[PDB]
Every structure is written in structure tokens, then in C-alpha cells.
Amino acid sequence: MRLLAVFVSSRLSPEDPLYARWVRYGEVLAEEGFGLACGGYQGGMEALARGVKAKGGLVVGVTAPAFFPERRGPNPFVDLELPAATLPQRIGRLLDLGAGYLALPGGVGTLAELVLAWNLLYLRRGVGRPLAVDPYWLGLLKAHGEIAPEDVGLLRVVADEEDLRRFLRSL
């Protein structure tokens, strides 16, 4: 089985319209034959996990307990927990788990994951895997100095469930 690693907001509230959209994204990736690799906590991670479980898919959660003692453990929808001790280690595990990556809206932590995956594609040596981003990120990541338009062009865009299915089908 293959997994889609998703990076997303940890603070997203269930009442936020995006929460419901990500639950649907979870259902869709499961329907497309994929499982989910995520940070294993709340916000968008739980929204995605709920959708995947609703469709019988598998959810892997790469947690970081040392950094969040306040977070009792992975959300209820995580099947396998893979606790990481450092941020680079956590990110490295998510990247190695997924056949492709999707960066949904989030903060600095989500950006860290996005940029490391981007970095692998940027090396242009056949390392890493396809990376898609929600349009949200293009409002921030743009050509600038040594970051060329072509580098930004390595980022694929997934704005809705149809884009998501096409992305997954290309992995």
C-alpha cells in the first residue's frame, strides 16, 4: 500500500469550513487507494484522518511527544504511531513514508515540511517525490532572488478534490 503524506494546520477548528473540506480530502485519498501519513494530532490532521477511516483506509501518525507533552497522544483515528524525537527526524519520516506530498494551509511548522520536500525536488537528482500545494501557499512562496520561477514551478497545485484525484493518480 502507498501513502500520501499531508502537511496541515494543527490548530484548525472543526467549525472552520476548511475542516470539512479536509475530511473530504481524506475520504478521497482512501477511495483512490492510498493511506495517510500525517503529524498524528488535531486540527487538519484529525480531519484528514477521520475521512480516511470513514473510507476504510490506513492512517500513520508521526508524532513528536517530547515537543507536546500536553498532547496526550495521537488522535483516535491514527492506526500506527511513529513517534519522532526531533523536528528534522519527524519530517524525514513523513517524507520517507509518502509516495507524494500535499501541503494544505498551515503555519511555520507546515511550511518547514513543505520546504524540505520542495528542497528535494529542487536538487533535481531524482530524489524526493511529487509535491502539491494548496493555492494558499503560492500567496507566500514566489520567485525571489536565487529562488527562481522554475523552482516555484516544481510545486504542483491542488485546489479541490478533483485536483487531488488527478495528483494521486499520477503518483
Short mmCIF file of N, CA and C in Angstrom, two decimals:
data_model
loop_
_atom_site.label_atom_id
_atom_site.label_comp_id
_atom_site.label_asym_id
_atom_site.label_seq_id
_atom_site.Cartn_x
_atom_site.Cartn_y
_atom_site.Cartn_z
N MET A 1 0.85 -1.22 0.00
CA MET A 1 0.00 0.00 0.00
C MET A 1 0.87 1.25 0.00
N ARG A 2 0.35 2.34 -0.56
CA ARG A 2 1.11 3.58 -0.61
C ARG A 2 0.38 4.65 0.18
N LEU A 3 1.14 5.63 0.67
CA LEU A 3 0.57 6.70 1.46
C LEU A 3 0.82 8.07 0.87
N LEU A 4 -0.10 8.98 1.15
CA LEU A 4 0.05 10.37 0.76
C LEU A 4 0.41 11.05 2.09
N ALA A 5 1.53 11.77 2.13
CA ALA A 5 1.91 12.48 3.35
C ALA A 5 1.30 13.87 3.22
N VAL A 6 0.55 14.30 4.22
CA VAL A 6 -0.09 15.61 4.17
C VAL A 6 0.40 16.50 5.31
N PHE A 7 0.70 17.75 4.98
CA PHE A 7 1.15 18.74 5.97
C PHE A 7 -0.01 19.71 6.10
N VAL A 8 -0.43 20.01 7.33
CA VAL A 8 -1.59 20.88 7.51
C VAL A 8 -1.69 21.46 8.92
N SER A 9 -2.44 22.56 9.01
CA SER A 9 -2.70 23.29 10.25
C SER A 9 -3.00 22.37 11.43
N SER A 10 -2.37 22.65 12.56
CA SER A 10 -2.59 21.85 13.75
C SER A 10 -3.67 22.50 14.60
N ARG A 11 -3.98 23.75 14.32
CA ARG A 11 -4.96 24.48 15.11
C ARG A 11 -6.36 24.58 14.51
N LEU A 12 -6.51 24.14 13.26
CA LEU A 12 -7.80 24.20 12.57
C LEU A 12 -8.97 23.72 13.42
N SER A 13 -9.98 24.57 13.56
CA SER A 13 -11.16 24.24 14.35
C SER A 13 -12.19 23.48 13.50
N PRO A 14 -12.88 22.50 14.10
CA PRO A 14 -13.90 21.71 13.40
C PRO A 14 -14.99 22.57 12.77
N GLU A 15 -15.19 23.77 13.32
CA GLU A 15 -16.21 24.67 12.80
C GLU A 15 -15.73 25.50 11.61
N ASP A 16 -14.43 25.40 11.32
CA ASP A 16 -13.85 26.12 10.19
C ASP A 16 -14.29 25.33 8.96
N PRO A 17 -14.75 26.02 7.90
CA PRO A 17 -15.19 25.32 6.69
C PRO A 17 -14.10 24.43 6.09
N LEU A 18 -12.84 24.82 6.26
CA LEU A 18 -11.75 24.01 5.71
C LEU A 18 -11.68 22.64 6.38
N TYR A 19 -12.07 22.56 7.65
CA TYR A 19 -12.01 21.28 8.36
C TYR A 19 -12.83 20.24 7.60
N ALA A 20 -14.06 20.60 7.23
CA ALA A 20 -14.93 19.68 6.49
C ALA A 20 -14.35 19.35 5.12
N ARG A 21 -13.66 20.32 4.50
CA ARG A 21 -13.06 20.08 3.19
C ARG A 21 -11.92 19.07 3.30
N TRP A 22 -11.18 19.13 4.40
CA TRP A 22 -10.07 18.20 4.58
C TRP A 22 -10.58 16.80 4.95
N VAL A 23 -11.73 16.73 5.62
CA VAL A 23 -12.28 15.42 5.95
C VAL A 23 -12.57 14.76 4.60
N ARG A 24 -13.18 15.52 3.69
CA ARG A 24 -13.50 15.02 2.36
C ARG A 24 -12.23 14.61 1.61
N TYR A 25 -11.15 15.38 1.76
CA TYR A 25 -9.88 15.02 1.11
C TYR A 25 -9.42 13.66 1.64
N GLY A 26 -9.66 13.41 2.92
CA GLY A 26 -9.27 12.12 3.50
C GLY A 26 -10.05 10.98 2.85
N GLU A 27 -11.35 11.18 2.68
CA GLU A 27 -12.21 10.18 2.06
C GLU A 27 -11.73 9.91 0.65
N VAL A 28 -11.44 10.99 -0.07
CA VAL A 28 -10.97 10.88 -1.45
C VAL A 28 -9.65 10.12 -1.59
N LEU A 29 -8.66 10.41 -0.75
CA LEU A 29 -7.40 9.70 -0.90
C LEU A 29 -7.57 8.21 -0.61
N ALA A 30 -8.46 7.87 0.33
CA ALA A 30 -8.73 6.47 0.65
C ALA A 30 -9.41 5.81 -0.54
N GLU A 31 -10.33 6.52 -1.18
CA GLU A 31 -11.04 6.00 -2.35
C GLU A 31 -10.08 5.75 -3.49
N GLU A 32 -9.06 6.60 -3.59
CA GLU A 32 -8.06 6.48 -4.64
C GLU A 32 -7.03 5.38 -4.36
N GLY A 33 -7.22 4.66 -3.26
CA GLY A 33 -6.33 3.57 -2.92
C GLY A 33 -5.13 3.90 -2.04
N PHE A 34 -5.10 5.10 -1.47
CA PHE A 34 -3.99 5.49 -0.62
C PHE A 34 -4.33 5.53 0.85
N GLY A 35 -3.28 5.46 1.67
CA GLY A 35 -3.43 5.59 3.11
C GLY A 35 -2.86 6.98 3.40
N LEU A 36 -2.90 7.41 4.66
CA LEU A 36 -2.42 8.74 5.05
C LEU A 36 -1.26 8.74 6.04
N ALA A 37 -0.29 9.62 5.81
CA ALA A 37 0.83 9.80 6.73
C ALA A 37 0.69 11.27 7.14
N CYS A 38 0.61 11.52 8.44
CA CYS A 38 0.48 12.90 8.92
C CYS A 38 1.12 13.03 10.29
N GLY A 39 1.03 14.23 10.86
CA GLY A 39 1.62 14.52 12.15
C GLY A 39 0.94 13.85 13.32
N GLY A 40 -0.20 13.22 13.05
CA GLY A 40 -0.93 12.49 14.08
C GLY A 40 -1.70 13.21 15.17
N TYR A 41 -1.82 14.54 15.09
CA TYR A 41 -2.54 15.24 16.15
C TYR A 41 -3.91 15.79 15.74
N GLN A 42 -4.25 16.99 16.20
CA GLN A 42 -5.56 17.60 15.91
C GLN A 42 -5.61 18.48 14.68
N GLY A 43 -6.57 19.40 14.66
CA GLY A 43 -6.71 20.29 13.53
C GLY A 43 -6.92 19.49 12.26
N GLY A 44 -6.24 19.91 11.19
CA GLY A 44 -6.36 19.24 9.91
C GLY A 44 -5.90 17.79 9.90
N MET A 45 -4.98 17.44 10.79
CA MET A 45 -4.51 16.05 10.83
C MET A 45 -5.64 15.12 11.23
N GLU A 46 -6.45 15.54 12.20
CA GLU A 46 -7.56 14.71 12.63
C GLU A 46 -8.67 14.73 11.59
N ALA A 47 -8.88 15.88 10.96
CA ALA A 47 -9.91 15.98 9.93
C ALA A 47 -9.58 15.00 8.81
N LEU A 48 -8.33 15.01 8.35
CA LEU A 48 -7.91 14.10 7.28
C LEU A 48 -8.03 12.65 7.72
N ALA A 49 -7.57 12.36 8.93
CA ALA A 49 -7.61 11.00 9.46
C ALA A 49 -9.06 10.49 9.54
N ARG A 50 -9.99 11.33 9.99
CA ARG A 50 -11.40 10.92 10.09
C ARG A 50 -11.95 10.50 8.73
N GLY A 51 -11.62 11.27 7.70
CA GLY A 51 -12.08 10.95 6.36
C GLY A 51 -11.51 9.63 5.86
N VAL A 52 -10.21 9.44 6.04
CA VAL A 52 -9.57 8.20 5.62
C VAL A 52 -10.20 7.00 6.33
N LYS A 53 -10.42 7.11 7.64
CA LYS A 53 -11.01 5.99 8.36
C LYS A 53 -12.46 5.74 7.93
N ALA A 54 -13.16 6.81 7.55
CA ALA A 54 -14.55 6.66 7.10
C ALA A 54 -14.61 5.79 5.84
N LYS A 55 -13.53 5.79 5.07
CA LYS A 55 -13.46 5.00 3.84
C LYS A 55 -12.62 3.72 3.97
N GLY A 56 -12.35 3.32 5.21
CA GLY A 56 -11.59 2.10 5.43
C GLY A 56 -10.09 2.14 5.18
N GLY A 57 -9.53 3.34 5.03
CA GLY A 57 -8.10 3.47 4.79
C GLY A 57 -7.25 3.40 6.05
N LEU A 58 -5.93 3.43 5.85
CA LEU A 58 -4.97 3.36 6.95
C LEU A 58 -4.36 4.72 7.24
N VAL A 59 -4.15 5.01 8.52
CA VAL A 59 -3.57 6.29 8.94
C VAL A 59 -2.34 6.09 9.82
N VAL A 60 -1.23 6.68 9.39
CA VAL A 60 0.03 6.63 10.13
C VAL A 60 0.29 8.01 10.70
N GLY A 61 0.57 8.09 12.00
CA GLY A 61 0.82 9.37 12.63
C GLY A 61 2.23 9.49 13.17
N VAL A 62 2.99 10.42 12.61
CA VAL A 62 4.36 10.66 13.06
C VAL A 62 4.30 11.80 14.07
N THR A 63 4.19 11.41 15.33
CA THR A 63 4.08 12.35 16.44
C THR A 63 5.45 12.87 16.91
N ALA A 64 5.43 13.78 17.88
CA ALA A 64 6.65 14.35 18.42
C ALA A 64 6.33 14.67 19.87
N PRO A 65 6.07 13.63 20.67
CA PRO A 65 5.73 13.74 22.09
C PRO A 65 6.60 14.66 22.95
N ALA A 66 7.91 14.62 22.76
CA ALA A 66 8.80 15.47 23.55
C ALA A 66 8.46 16.94 23.40
N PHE A 67 7.94 17.31 22.23
CA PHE A 67 7.60 18.69 21.98
C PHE A 67 6.19 19.06 22.42
N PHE A 68 5.32 18.07 22.58
CA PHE A 68 3.95 18.34 23.00
C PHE A 68 3.47 17.45 24.14
N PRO A 69 4.13 17.52 25.31
CA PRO A 69 3.71 16.68 26.43
C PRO A 69 2.22 16.91 26.71
N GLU A 70 1.76 18.12 26.41
CA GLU A 70 0.36 18.49 26.61
C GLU A 70 -0.60 17.74 25.69
N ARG A 71 -0.06 17.14 24.62
CA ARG A 71 -0.88 16.36 23.70
C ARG A 71 -0.73 14.90 24.12
N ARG A 72 -1.75 14.39 24.81
CA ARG A 72 -1.80 13.02 25.33
C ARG A 72 -1.31 11.90 24.41
N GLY A 73 -1.46 12.10 23.11
CA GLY A 73 -1.04 11.09 22.16
C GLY A 73 -1.68 11.38 20.82
N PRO A 74 -1.55 10.47 19.84
CA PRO A 74 -2.15 10.70 18.52
C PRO A 74 -3.67 10.73 18.60
N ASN A 75 -4.31 11.30 17.59
CA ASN A 75 -5.77 11.36 17.58
C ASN A 75 -6.31 9.93 17.44
N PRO A 76 -7.59 9.71 17.79
CA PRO A 76 -8.27 8.41 17.75
C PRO A 76 -8.31 7.70 16.40
N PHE A 77 -8.09 8.44 15.33
CA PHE A 77 -8.14 7.85 14.00
C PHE A 77 -6.79 7.39 13.44
N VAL A 78 -5.74 7.49 14.25
CA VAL A 78 -4.42 7.06 13.81
C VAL A 78 -4.27 5.57 14.11
N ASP A 79 -3.89 4.80 13.10
CA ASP A 79 -3.71 3.36 13.27
C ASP A 79 -2.33 3.02 13.79
N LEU A 80 -1.31 3.65 13.21
CA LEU A 80 0.05 3.37 13.61
C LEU A 80 0.74 4.65 14.02
N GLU A 81 1.32 4.65 15.22
CA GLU A 81 2.04 5.82 15.70
C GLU A 81 3.53 5.58 15.53
N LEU A 82 4.22 6.60 15.03
CA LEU A 82 5.67 6.55 14.82
C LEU A 82 6.21 7.82 15.47
N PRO A 83 6.48 7.76 16.79
CA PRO A 83 6.99 8.95 17.49
C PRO A 83 8.40 9.36 17.09
N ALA A 84 8.58 10.66 16.84
CA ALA A 84 9.87 11.21 16.45
C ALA A 84 10.39 12.08 17.59
N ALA A 85 11.71 12.10 17.76
CA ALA A 85 12.37 12.85 18.83
C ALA A 85 12.82 14.27 18.47
N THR A 86 12.93 14.57 17.18
CA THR A 86 13.35 15.91 16.74
C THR A 86 12.50 16.32 15.55
N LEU A 87 12.49 17.61 15.23
CA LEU A 87 11.69 18.04 14.08
C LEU A 87 12.26 17.51 12.77
N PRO A 88 13.58 17.60 12.58
CA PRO A 88 14.10 17.08 11.31
C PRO A 88 13.78 15.59 11.15
N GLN A 89 13.85 14.84 12.24
CA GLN A 89 13.57 13.41 12.19
C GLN A 89 12.11 13.15 11.85
N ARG A 90 11.23 13.97 12.43
CA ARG A 90 9.80 13.84 12.20
C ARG A 90 9.51 14.07 10.72
N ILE A 91 10.06 15.15 10.17
CA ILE A 91 9.85 15.48 8.77
C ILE A 91 10.44 14.39 7.87
N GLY A 92 11.67 13.98 8.16
CA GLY A 92 12.30 12.93 7.37
C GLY A 92 11.45 11.67 7.31
N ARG A 93 10.80 11.32 8.42
CA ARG A 93 9.96 10.13 8.43
C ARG A 93 8.71 10.33 7.57
N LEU A 94 8.08 11.50 7.65
CA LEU A 94 6.91 11.74 6.81
C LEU A 94 7.29 11.66 5.33
N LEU A 95 8.44 12.24 4.97
CA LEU A 95 8.86 12.22 3.57
C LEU A 95 9.14 10.79 3.09
N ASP A 96 9.78 9.98 3.93
CA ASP A 96 10.08 8.62 3.52
C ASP A 96 8.85 7.72 3.48
N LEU A 97 7.81 8.09 4.22
CA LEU A 97 6.57 7.31 4.25
C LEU A 97 5.68 7.53 3.03
N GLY A 98 5.72 8.74 2.48
CA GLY A 98 4.83 9.04 1.38
C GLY A 98 5.33 8.89 -0.03
N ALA A 99 4.42 8.53 -0.92
CA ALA A 99 4.71 8.38 -2.34
C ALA A 99 4.55 9.75 -3.01
N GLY A 100 3.91 10.67 -2.28
CA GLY A 100 3.69 12.02 -2.76
C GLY A 100 3.35 12.85 -1.55
N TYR A 101 3.36 14.18 -1.68
CA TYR A 101 3.08 15.06 -0.56
C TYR A 101 2.09 16.14 -0.92
N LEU A 102 1.32 16.57 0.07
CA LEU A 102 0.35 17.64 -0.14
C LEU A 102 0.48 18.61 1.02
N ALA A 103 0.71 19.88 0.71
CA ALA A 103 0.82 20.87 1.79
C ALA A 103 -0.45 21.71 1.79
N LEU A 104 -1.30 21.47 2.78
CA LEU A 104 -2.55 22.22 2.93
C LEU A 104 -2.21 23.46 3.76
N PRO A 105 -3.15 24.42 3.89
CA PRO A 105 -2.85 25.62 4.67
C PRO A 105 -2.41 25.32 6.10
N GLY A 106 -1.41 26.06 6.57
CA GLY A 106 -0.92 25.88 7.92
C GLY A 106 0.07 26.97 8.27
N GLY A 107 0.76 26.80 9.39
CA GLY A 107 1.73 27.80 9.83
C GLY A 107 3.18 27.42 9.59
N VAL A 108 4.07 27.99 10.39
CA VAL A 108 5.50 27.74 10.24
C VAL A 108 5.88 26.27 10.22
N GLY A 109 5.22 25.46 11.05
CA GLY A 109 5.53 24.03 11.09
C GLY A 109 5.17 23.33 9.79
N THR A 110 4.06 23.75 9.20
CA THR A 110 3.63 23.18 7.94
C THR A 110 4.58 23.66 6.84
N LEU A 111 5.03 24.91 6.94
CA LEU A 111 5.96 25.44 5.95
C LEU A 111 7.29 24.66 5.98
N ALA A 112 7.76 24.32 7.19
CA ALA A 112 9.01 23.57 7.34
C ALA A 112 8.97 22.26 6.56
N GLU A 113 7.83 21.58 6.63
CA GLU A 113 7.64 20.31 5.93
C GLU A 113 7.60 20.54 4.42
N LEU A 114 6.83 21.54 4.02
CA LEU A 114 6.69 21.89 2.62
C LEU A 114 8.06 22.19 2.01
N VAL A 115 8.81 23.09 2.63
CA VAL A 115 10.11 23.47 2.09
C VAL A 115 11.14 22.34 2.03
N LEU A 116 11.13 21.43 3.01
CA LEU A 116 12.08 20.31 2.94
C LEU A 116 11.73 19.41 1.73
N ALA A 117 10.44 19.15 1.52
CA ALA A 117 10.03 18.33 0.38
C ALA A 117 10.41 19.07 -0.91
N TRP A 118 10.17 20.38 -0.92
CA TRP A 118 10.49 21.20 -2.08
C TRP A 118 11.99 21.13 -2.37
N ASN A 119 12.79 21.21 -1.30
CA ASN A 119 14.24 21.15 -1.39
C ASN A 119 14.69 19.89 -2.15
N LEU A 120 14.07 18.76 -1.85
CA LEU A 120 14.44 17.51 -2.52
C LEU A 120 14.19 17.58 -4.03
N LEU A 121 13.05 18.15 -4.43
CA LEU A 121 12.75 18.29 -5.85
C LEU A 121 13.70 19.29 -6.50
N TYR A 122 14.03 20.34 -5.76
CA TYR A 122 14.91 21.40 -6.22
C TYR A 122 16.31 20.87 -6.58
N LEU A 123 16.77 19.86 -5.85
CA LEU A 123 18.08 19.29 -6.14
C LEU A 123 18.10 18.70 -7.56
N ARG A 124 16.92 18.33 -8.05
CA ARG A 124 16.78 17.78 -9.40
C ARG A 124 17.75 16.64 -9.69
N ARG A 125 17.74 15.63 -8.82
CA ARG A 125 18.61 14.47 -8.99
C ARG A 125 17.80 13.19 -8.77
N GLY A 126 16.50 13.27 -9.03
CA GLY A 126 15.65 12.11 -8.86
C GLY A 126 15.41 11.70 -7.42
N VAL A 127 15.57 12.63 -6.48
CA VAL A 127 15.31 12.30 -5.07
C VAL A 127 13.99 12.96 -4.67
N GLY A 128 13.41 12.53 -3.55
CA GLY A 128 12.14 13.10 -3.15
C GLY A 128 10.98 12.50 -3.94
N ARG A 129 9.80 13.11 -3.84
CA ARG A 129 8.59 12.64 -4.53
C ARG A 129 7.76 13.88 -4.90
N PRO A 130 6.72 13.71 -5.74
CA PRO A 130 5.89 14.86 -6.14
C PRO A 130 5.29 15.61 -4.95
N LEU A 131 5.27 16.93 -5.07
CA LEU A 131 4.74 17.80 -4.03
C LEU A 131 3.68 18.74 -4.56
N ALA A 132 2.50 18.68 -3.97
CA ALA A 132 1.41 19.54 -4.36
C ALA A 132 1.13 20.49 -3.20
N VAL A 133 0.70 21.70 -3.53
CA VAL A 133 0.37 22.67 -2.50
C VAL A 133 -0.99 23.28 -2.76
N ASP A 134 -1.66 23.65 -1.68
CA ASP A 134 -2.95 24.32 -1.78
C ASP A 134 -2.56 25.75 -2.20
N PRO A 135 -3.36 26.39 -3.07
CA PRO A 135 -3.11 27.76 -3.55
C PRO A 135 -2.65 28.73 -2.47
N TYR A 136 -3.11 28.51 -1.24
CA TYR A 136 -2.74 29.32 -0.08
C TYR A 136 -1.24 29.59 -0.05
N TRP A 137 -0.45 28.54 -0.26
CA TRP A 137 0.99 28.68 -0.21
C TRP A 137 1.61 29.53 -1.30
N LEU A 138 0.95 29.66 -2.44
CA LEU A 138 1.51 30.47 -3.51
C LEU A 138 1.38 31.97 -3.21
N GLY A 139 0.63 32.29 -2.16
CA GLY A 139 0.50 33.69 -1.76
C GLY A 139 1.74 34.07 -0.96
N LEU A 140 2.53 33.07 -0.60
CA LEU A 140 3.76 33.28 0.18
C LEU A 140 5.00 32.90 -0.63
N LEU A 141 5.02 31.68 -1.14
CA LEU A 141 6.17 31.21 -1.90
C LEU A 141 6.09 31.71 -3.34
N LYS A 142 7.06 32.54 -3.70
CA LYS A 142 7.11 33.15 -5.02
C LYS A 142 8.58 33.31 -5.39
N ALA A 143 8.85 33.60 -6.66
CA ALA A 143 10.22 33.81 -7.11
C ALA A 143 10.81 34.97 -6.33
N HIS A 144 12.08 34.84 -5.95
CA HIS A 144 12.75 35.88 -5.17
C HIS A 144 14.23 35.57 -5.10
N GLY A 145 15.04 36.46 -5.67
CA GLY A 145 16.48 36.26 -5.65
C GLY A 145 16.87 34.93 -6.28
N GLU A 146 17.61 34.12 -5.53
CA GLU A 146 18.05 32.82 -6.02
C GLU A 146 16.94 31.78 -6.16
N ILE A 147 15.75 32.08 -5.65
CA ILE A 147 14.62 31.16 -5.78
C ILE A 147 13.99 31.56 -7.10
N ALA A 148 14.21 30.73 -8.11
CA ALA A 148 13.74 31.03 -9.44
C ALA A 148 12.29 30.66 -9.70
N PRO A 149 11.71 31.24 -10.76
CA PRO A 149 10.32 30.95 -11.13
C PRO A 149 10.20 29.45 -11.40
N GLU A 150 11.25 28.88 -11.98
CA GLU A 150 11.28 27.46 -12.29
C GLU A 150 11.27 26.61 -11.02
N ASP A 151 11.84 27.14 -9.94
CA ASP A 151 11.86 26.40 -8.68
C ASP A 151 10.43 26.38 -8.14
N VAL A 152 9.77 27.53 -8.22
CA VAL A 152 8.39 27.64 -7.77
C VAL A 152 7.52 26.74 -8.65
N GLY A 153 7.92 26.61 -9.91
CA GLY A 153 7.19 25.76 -10.84
C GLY A 153 7.27 24.27 -10.53
N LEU A 154 8.17 23.87 -9.64
CA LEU A 154 8.29 22.47 -9.27
C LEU A 154 7.12 22.10 -8.38
N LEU A 155 6.48 23.13 -7.82
CA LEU A 155 5.34 22.91 -6.94
C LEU A 155 4.07 22.70 -7.76
N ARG A 156 3.39 21.59 -7.53
CA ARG A 156 2.14 21.34 -8.24
C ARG A 156 1.00 21.93 -7.42
N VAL A 157 -0.10 22.30 -8.07
CA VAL A 157 -1.21 22.91 -7.35
C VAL A 157 -2.45 22.02 -7.22
N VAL A 158 -2.93 21.86 -5.99
CA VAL A 158 -4.14 21.08 -5.70
C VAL A 158 -5.08 22.02 -4.95
N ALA A 159 -6.14 22.46 -5.63
CA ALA A 159 -7.09 23.39 -5.05
C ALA A 159 -8.43 22.77 -4.65
N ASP A 160 -8.74 21.59 -5.17
CA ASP A 160 -10.01 20.94 -4.85
C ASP A 160 -9.89 19.43 -4.97
N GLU A 161 -10.95 18.70 -4.63
CA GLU A 161 -10.89 17.25 -4.69
C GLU A 161 -10.58 16.66 -6.07
N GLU A 162 -10.97 17.36 -7.14
CA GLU A 162 -10.67 16.88 -8.48
C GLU A 162 -9.17 16.96 -8.74
N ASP A 163 -8.55 18.06 -8.31
CA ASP A 163 -7.11 18.21 -8.48
C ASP A 163 -6.43 17.11 -7.67
N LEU A 164 -6.96 16.87 -6.48
CA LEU A 164 -6.40 15.85 -5.61
C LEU A 164 -6.41 14.46 -6.26
N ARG A 165 -7.53 14.09 -6.87
CA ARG A 165 -7.61 12.78 -7.52
C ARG A 165 -6.59 12.71 -8.68
N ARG A 166 -6.49 13.76 -9.48
CA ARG A 166 -5.54 13.75 -10.59
C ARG A 166 -4.11 13.63 -10.07
N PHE A 167 -3.83 14.32 -8.96
CA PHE A 167 -2.50 14.27 -8.36
C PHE A 167 -2.17 12.85 -7.92
N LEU A 168 -3.09 12.24 -7.17
CA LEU A 168 -2.89 10.88 -6.66
C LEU A 168 -2.75 9.86 -7.78
N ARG A 169 -3.53 10.03 -8.83
CA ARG A 169 -3.49 9.11 -9.96
C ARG A 169 -2.18 9.20 -10.72
N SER A 170 -1.43 10.29 -10.51
CA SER A 170 -0.16 10.46 -11.20
C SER A 170 1.02 9.95 -10.39
N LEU A 171 0.78 9.53 -9.15
CA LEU A 171 1.88 9.06 -8.31
C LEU A 171 2.37 7.66 -8.64
#
